[PDB]
Amino acid sequence: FTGNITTSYSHTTDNSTAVQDSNGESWNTGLSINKGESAYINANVRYYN
Amino acid sequence: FTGNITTSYSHTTDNSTAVQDSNGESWNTGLSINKGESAYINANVRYYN
């Protein structure tokens, strides 16, 4: 009939370093319109007599 | 014929610190145009008699 009791203690010290490099590109397109004055009209006309 | 039963208990305490430094650069270019008035025209003219 065997038995055993164990007690343990541990201490850990850690140091770390890190370097990150990032590059990115972006492309946007946009379109806006006014609902009051949306377009202009030109009329080609001739007079008669 | 041997046998064994083991029971264990563990407790861990941890503290950490970290410092991060970041530097970044950015460059943008943009071009916009109006589809109603896109350009202006100048005409070099002369009169004759």
DSSP A10-34: -------------------------
| Residue B40 distance to chain A (closest CA, Å) | 16
Separation CA A42–CA B35 (nearest Å)? 15
Q: Which residues of B touch A28 (CB under 8 A)?
A: 30
| R_g (Cα) of chain B, nearest Å | 40
Q: How far is CA B44 from CA A16, B38, B41, in A?
A: 73, 20, 10
Separation CA B30–CA A26 (nearest Å)? 12
Widest distance between CA atoms in chain B: 132
Separation CA B30–CA B9 (nearest Å)? 64
Q: How far apart are the first and last CA of chain B?
A: 132
CB B8, CB A4: distance < 8 Å: no
Q: Which residue has the tokens 């609902």?
A: A35
Separation CA B49–CA B35 (nearest Å)? 40
Q: Using CA coordinates, name the residue in chain A closest to B19.
A: A17
Contacts across the A-B interface (CB distance below 8 Å): 3
Residue type present at position B41: I
